[PDB]
């Protein structure tokens, strides 16, 4: 509406993640990515198809890394780039993303909303904002 301030939006997925933002009734993109999970890529004792399934323990390191990415994305020097935070992910990941031990101490204090995504990033990402455009 008026006097709007920027709010983060976090789309988190295991084999790639999109980090967006919500400002007023408009939407912005900060970064988009694809990240390669475990070391073996079908060249080893571990089966290639099964390898990605095997990782899920590794998802946690990946999530922290994603969380580590959010701080650089949402914090600078001593700056904060968000007026508040919105978390979005599959299988209720965001809900899981809170968890202060992995997530940042600083973001956790910016915890505003958690929503699912229709799918991955962009389209889910656009929908979540429309659905939560007026609460921000």
State the method. NMR
Give me the domains of the chain, ranges plus CATH numbers: 1-136 (3.30.420.60)
The answer to whether 66 touches 74, Cβ cutoff 8 Å, is: no
Spatial neighbors of 40 by CB under 8 A, at least 6 apart, are: 46, 48, 51
Distance CA 127, CA 121 (A): 10
Extract the tokens encoding 132: 């939560």
Q: Burial level of 83, CB count in 10 A (0-12/13-18/19+)?
A: middle
| 3's tokens | 């006097």
**Distance from C-alpha of 95 to C-alpha of 32, rounded to nearest angstrom:** 21
Q: H-type helices in the chain, by residue range?
A: 48-55, 59-74, 93-97, 105-108, 122-131
CA distance 21 to 40: 34
Q: Which helix (H) or strand (E) holds 31?
A: strand 26-33
Q: Are 14 and 63 in contact (CB under 8 A)?
A: no
């Amino acid at each position: 509406l008026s006097d709007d301030s920027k709010f983060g939006f976090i789309v988190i997925d295991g084999s790639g993640a999109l980090f967006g933002t919500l400002q007023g009734n408009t939407r912005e993109v900060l970064h988009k990515f694809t990240v390669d999970l475990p070391k073996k890529h079908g060249r080893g004792g571990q089966s290639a198809l099964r390898f990605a399934r095997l990782r899920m323990e590794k998802r946690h390191n990946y999530v922290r890394k994603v969380a580590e990415t959010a701080v650089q994305l949402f914090i600078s020097g001593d700056k904060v780039n968000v007026a508040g935070l919105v978390l979005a992910g599959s299988a209720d990941f965001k809900t899981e993303l809170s968890q202060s031990d992995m997530f940042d101490q600083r973001l956790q204090s910016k915890v505003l909303k958690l929503v699912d995504i229709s799918y991955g990033g962009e389209n889910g990402f656009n929908q979540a904002i429309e659905l939560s455009t007026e609460v921000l």
